[PDB]
C-alpha cells in the first residue's frame, strides 16, 4: 500500500530488531496485547486508558496508518508509559521495559535526516 518512506523504513527496522530474538528475553511482555481478564489484572483498563503493545505498532505500520516517524514513536512509548504507570518501579516487568526503551531510544536517535 506505498513504500514506507525513509523515516519510516528505519522505524520499521527498529521494530523489526525489537521483536527479533536478540532482545526477546527482555522483549516477551510487550509482544500481544496485556490480556487483563487473564492475567487477573481488573483494574488495568481503569488505569491504562490507551493500550499498546508491539503486534498493534506492527498491524498499524503494515495498515500505514503512522503518517510519520514521531506518530511510530509515541505508540512505542506509549507503550513503556503503560508499564511504568501500572506496575510498581522495583517489578521485574519495569526492568525489561527499560532495557527494550534503551535499545528503542538508542537506535531511534540514529534517524536519516
Ligand atoms: C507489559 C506489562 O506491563 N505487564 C505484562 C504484560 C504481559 C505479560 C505476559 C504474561 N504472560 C504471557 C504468557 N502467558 O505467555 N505473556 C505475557 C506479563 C506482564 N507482566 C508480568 C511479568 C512480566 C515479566 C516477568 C514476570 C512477570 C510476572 O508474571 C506484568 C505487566 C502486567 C501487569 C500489567
Known amino acids: 500500500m506505498g513504500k514506507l518512506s525513509e523515516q519510516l523504513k528505519h522505524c520499521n527496522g527498529i521494530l ?8 526477546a528475553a527482555y522483549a ?36 500505514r496508518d503512522y503518517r510519520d516517524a514521531q506518530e511510530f514513536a509515541a505508540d512505542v512509548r506509549l507503550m513503556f508509559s503503560n508499564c511504568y504507570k501500572y506496575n510498581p518501579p ?18 531511534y536517535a540514529k534517524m536519516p535526516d
Open 16 to 23: 523489526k530488531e525489537l521483536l527479533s530474538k536478540k532482545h
Open 90 to 107: 522495583d517489578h521485574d516487568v519495569v526492568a525489561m521495559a527499560r532495557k527494550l526503551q534503551d535499545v528503542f531510544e538508542f537506535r
Open 28 to 63: 516477551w511482555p510487550f509482544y500481544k496485547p496485556v490480556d487483563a481478564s487473564a492475567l487477573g489484572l481488573h483494574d488495568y483498563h481503569d488505569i491504562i486508558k490507551h493500550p499498546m503493545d508491539l503486534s498493534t505498532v506492527k498491524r498499524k505500520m503494515e495498515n
